[PDB]
Write a protein that binds this ligand. Sequence first.
Ligand SMILES: Nc1nc2c(ncn2[C@@H]2O[C@H](COP(=O)(O)OP(=O)(O)O)[C@@H](O)[C@H]2O)c(=O)[nH]1
Ligand SMILES: [Sr+2]
Length: 168
Amino acid sequence: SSLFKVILLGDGGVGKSSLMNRYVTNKFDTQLFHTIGVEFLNKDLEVDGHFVTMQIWDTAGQERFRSLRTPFYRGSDCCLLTFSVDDSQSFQNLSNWKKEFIYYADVPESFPFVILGNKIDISERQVSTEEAQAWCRDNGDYPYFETSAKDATNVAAAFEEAVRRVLA
Ligand SMILES: Nc1nc2c(ncn2[C@@H]2O[C@H](COP(=O)(O)OP(=O)(O)O)[C@@H](O)[C@H]2O)c(=O)[nH]1
Ligand SMILES: [Sr+2]
């Protein structure tokens, strides 16, 4: 309706649940449930003088739980591919997540994707801003945000870009 859907995809542990909670409730809690399956929260917004609800999903990241999450890709209006900057592996797996999304979502190389490098509050990184920025350029020229769910840094900024991408 005035409802649109976005999904966070990325390895387990990169901070998807926390990013959602920070965006939606402006809190960083340390003991979120571990969900074997998928999860969502409603974000009530107002764009162009209208009420719009962004429904934010994410999933379990383990390969063995693929079958539990891919039925909920459908209807996603934007995909937030997430890694954490402290974890090169998570960054290396971005193409994997994009391909999985594309396979199962059935949405076009014009689909809205947004890339979040999370846990930037972590000074000891495995991934440089430049290589992530690089990757985004060469892989669809997606917008890139360095975020911290813990300290809230760029989190609304990244979700707002998603909103406008969808709305566009
Ligand atoms: N330092 C730091 N820890 C974070 C951040 N985001 C999430 N966490 C922690 O990372 C761990 C995995 O978080 P979670 O939100 O469940 O990641 P998910 O599996 O991708 O949903 C948890 O212990 C979180 O508290 C962040 O930006 N910075
Ligand atoms: Sr989680």
